[PDB]
Amino acid sequence: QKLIANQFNSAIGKIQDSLSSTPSALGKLQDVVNQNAQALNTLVKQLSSNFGAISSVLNDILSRLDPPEAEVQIDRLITGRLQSLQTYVTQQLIRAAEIRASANLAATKMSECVLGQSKRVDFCGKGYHLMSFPQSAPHGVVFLHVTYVPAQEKNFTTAPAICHDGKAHFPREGVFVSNGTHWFVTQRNFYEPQIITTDNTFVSGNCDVVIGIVNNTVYDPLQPELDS
Amino acid sequence: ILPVSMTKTSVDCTMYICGDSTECSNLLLQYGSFCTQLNRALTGIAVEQDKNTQEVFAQVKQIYKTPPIKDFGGFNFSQILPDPSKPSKRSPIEDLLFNKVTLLICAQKFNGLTVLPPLLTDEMIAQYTSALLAGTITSGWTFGAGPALQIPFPMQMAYRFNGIGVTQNVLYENQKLIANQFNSAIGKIQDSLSSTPSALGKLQDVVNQNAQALNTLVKQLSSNFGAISSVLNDILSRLDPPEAEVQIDRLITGRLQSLQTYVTQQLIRAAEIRASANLAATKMSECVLGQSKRVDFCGKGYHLMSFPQSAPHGVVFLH
Amino acid sequence: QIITTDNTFVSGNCDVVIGIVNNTVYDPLQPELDS
Amino acid sequence: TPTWRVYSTGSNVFQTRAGCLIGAEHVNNSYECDIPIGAGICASYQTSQSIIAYTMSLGAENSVAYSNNSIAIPTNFTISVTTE
Ligand SMILES: *[C@@H]1O[C@H](CO)[C@@H](O)[C@H](O)[C@H]1NC(C)=O
Numbered sequence: 164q165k166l167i168a169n170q171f172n173s174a175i176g177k178i179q180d181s182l183s184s185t186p187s188a189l190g191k192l193q194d195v196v197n198q199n200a201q202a203l204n205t206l207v208k209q210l211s212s213n214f215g216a217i218s219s220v221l222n223d224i225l226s227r228l229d230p231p232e233a234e235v236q237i238d239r240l241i242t243g244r245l246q247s248l249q250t251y252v253t254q255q256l257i258r259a260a261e262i263r264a265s266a267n268l269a270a271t272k273m274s275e276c277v278l279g280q281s282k283r284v285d286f287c288g289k290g291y292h293l294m295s296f297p298q299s300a301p302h303g304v305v306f307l308h309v310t311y312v313p314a315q316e317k318n319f320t321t322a323p324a325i326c327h328d329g330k331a332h333f334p335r336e337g338v339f340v341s342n343g344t345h346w347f348v349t350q351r352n353f354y355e356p357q358i359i360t361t362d363n364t365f366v367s368g369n370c371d372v373v374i375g376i377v378n379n380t381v382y383d384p385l386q387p388e389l390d391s
Numbered sequence: 392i393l394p395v396s397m398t399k400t401s402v403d404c405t406m407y408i409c410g411d412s413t414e415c416s417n418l419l420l421q422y423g424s425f426c427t428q429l430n431r432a433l434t435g436i437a438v439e440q441d442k443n444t445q446e447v448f449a450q451v452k453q454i455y456k457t458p459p460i461k462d463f464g465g466f467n468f469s470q471i472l473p474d475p476s477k478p479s480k481r482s483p484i485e486d487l488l489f490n491k492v493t494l495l496i497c498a499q500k501f502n503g504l505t506v507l508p509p510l511l512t513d514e515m516i517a518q519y520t521s522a523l524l525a526g527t528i529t530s531g532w533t534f535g536a537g538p539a540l541q542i543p544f545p546m547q548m549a550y551r552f553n554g555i556g557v558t559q560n561v562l563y564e565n566q567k568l569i570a571n572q573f574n575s576a577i578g579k580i581q582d583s584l585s586s587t588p589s590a591l592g593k594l595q596d597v598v599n600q601n602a603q604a605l606n607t608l609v610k611q612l613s614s615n616f617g618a619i620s621s622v623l624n625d626i627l628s629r630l631d632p633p634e635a636e637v638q639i640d641r642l643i644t645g646r647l648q649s650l651q652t653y654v655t656q657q658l659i660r661a662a663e664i665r666a667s668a669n670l671a672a673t674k675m676s677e678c679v680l681g682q683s684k685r686v687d688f689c690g691k692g693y694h695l696m697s698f699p700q701s702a703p704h705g706v707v708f709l710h
Numbered sequence: 711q712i713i714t715t716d717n718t719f720v721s722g723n724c725d726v727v728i729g730i731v732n733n734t735v736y737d738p739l740q741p742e743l744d745s
Numbered sequence: 746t747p748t749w750r751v752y753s754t755g756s757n758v759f760q761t762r763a764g765c766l767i768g769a770e771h772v773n774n775s776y777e778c779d780i781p782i783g784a785g786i787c788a789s790y791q792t793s794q795s796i797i798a799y800t801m802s803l804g805a806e807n808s809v810a811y812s813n814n815s816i817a818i819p820t821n822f823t824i825s826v827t828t829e
């Protein structure tokens with residue numbers, strides 16, 4: 164508990180620091196604003212083109228020309244501006260589709276990695292997803308994930324089963340890791356190993372089929388001490 | 392089969408619309424920024440058409456290998472693993488794939504076309520997939536979360552079974568049989584693919600579509616768009632600029648419009664390819680570096696494991 | 711349900727866990743089975 | 746301008762499937778990618794100082810020494826916290 168706590172706490176400290184100093188990890192949120200500003204900026208700048216007329220100012224076209232033709236220059240400007248608007252709106256639609264995608268993705272990632280311990284690997288974050296935490300952000304959301312990352316190996320030598328009384332005892336919840344000497348401690352993912360009672364095993368069959376069985380004893384926790 | 396890319400291409404706007412024609416260029420400028428953004432959008436498409444590849448065949452972090460002795464209880468997968476003989480280290484399946492999916496180019500180049508080369512050439516992509524696969528054969532559901540832990544392969548298939556619902560017992564006992572079933576099935580795969588009942592189909596449409604679109608574009612650079620001609624030179628060799636303007640504008644308008652159409656199509660397709668690549672990225676990191684209980688989200692029926700395989704412009708999963 | 715050694719399991723001593731409430735445990739065989 | 750003149754000549758040229766980038770150096774080593782060009786060839790600054798282009802490296806070569814009967818258990822666990 165404390166030694167797990169300590170880790171959690173310190174690590175949250177890091178999340179701050181990695182997003183506190185000036186490492187710009189908020190690129191994905193910045194890009195949206197930059198793209199939108201650029202689009203609006205271009206749309207505004209498109210007003211200074213005359214699309215092949217004499218000028219790009221309406222007050223200027225009327226004051227040097229006669230309405231018989233003026234319409235042609237005006238129509239030119241009209242067409243140009245209109246096309247520009249079309250382009251802007253179309254790219255806005257396309258971008259909105261992507262933002263909607265990113266949303267639905269996020270919405271899922273919420274439901275699962277924040278109201279549950281969803282298993283699916285690399286959908287909450289690298290490792291196994293203990294728990295998460297959401298944090299809102301300018302035009303977006305930021306997830307924190309608290310995961311389980313194993314380290315510090317031990318390359319022990321397993322077997323596949325333990326035949327003791329001519330019958331084959333398969334392992335219940337671990338993968339029987341006969342460590343170097345007394346070949347029988349039965350672990351489980353981590354390292355806590357205990358002796359093979361007939362309660363972490365489950366008998367099945369005879370000792371010829373599963374190739375690789377290595378005999379020794381399967382201890383029985385009942386008879387030989389309470390024979391009263 | 393799943394597509395994960397698209398031939399990244401752009402088109403130098405100006406030289407498309409105008410051909411070298413200074414007067415044309417000038418007239419074009421007048422039309423505002425209306426093709427800086429064009430080129431920009433295409434470039435954005437390209438960048439995405441690369442990051443896609445990164446998302447899928449690059450979620451490993453450490454290229455692994457395989458032991459020199461093949462003591463796997465019995466599985467003979469020397470299909471999926473790379474075979475030294477073939478030049479670019481490629482599994483036989485990968486080869487069959489490449490050779491099947493196949494397709495002027497420099498000619499349409501001579502119109503403004505450009506087909507930028509990928510950042511991840513094939514050999515590297517293969518190498519990544521080989522890594523992943525190798526990791527799976529001897530790390531199980533671990534090299535995708537934390538370090539990489541060796542587990543003997545019989546001994547690993549058992550735990551996946553345990554996942555399915557059958558208890559370890561089954562596998563360890565009737566090992567011989569399941570070995571053979573696996574063996575032969577892998578055998579059949581090369582046939583089914585190497586046959587031609589529209590196998591690598593989806594990976595082919597991407598190409599056909601793109602090519603076709605590009606071709607349409609080029610062809611449109613031959614339509615007078617309702618102007619005197621469509622070569623720009625004959626206008627500028629029969630007329631003075633005063634009158635030239637008229638025809639020149641007619642053309643410029645038509646050509647620009649076409650270029651628009653093309654880029655908008657390209658964008659809408661790139662969105663779909665991105666969706667497909669995201670689906671891949673999941674499929675990989677949920678049905679390749681780990682079992683998944685999402686029915687059919689890894690394949691038909693209960694799922695034991697998968698194997699990825701690289702194919703032109705796309706991933707080919709062997710579930 | 712009554713606490714027996716059938717629905718629980720043993721691990722370690724009783725000065726490491728916080729809040730372990732050390733209080734009783736029944737056993738399946740401990741009755742007349744222990745004749 | 747005579748400043749564009751140095752960037753069209755010289756002994757520093759390395760043809761690539763990408764193209765003919767000039768002002769580079771095709772070292773025989775391999776590092777992790779930086780500014781990405783295409784077809785593998787990457788480039789980045791280094792150490793007396795010059796933009797180098799290198800055939801990118803995919804990562805450190807490992808080999809999970811697996812035998813036929815040896816399982817490996819992790820014996821301590823570090824709780825990271827990641828961001829997205
Ligand atoms: C709960 O907290 C109290 C302090 O208010 C403490 O005395 C007690 O031991 C705690 N019980 C636990 C942790 O089970």
Ligand SMILES: *[C@@H]1O[C@H](CO)[C@@H](O)[C@H](O)[C@H]1NC(C)=O
Nearest residue numbers: 769770771772773774797798
């Ligand atoms: C790189 O290696 C090749 C052959 O191995 C050699 O010819 C060349 O001079 C080397 N270049 C440098 C810069 O070391």
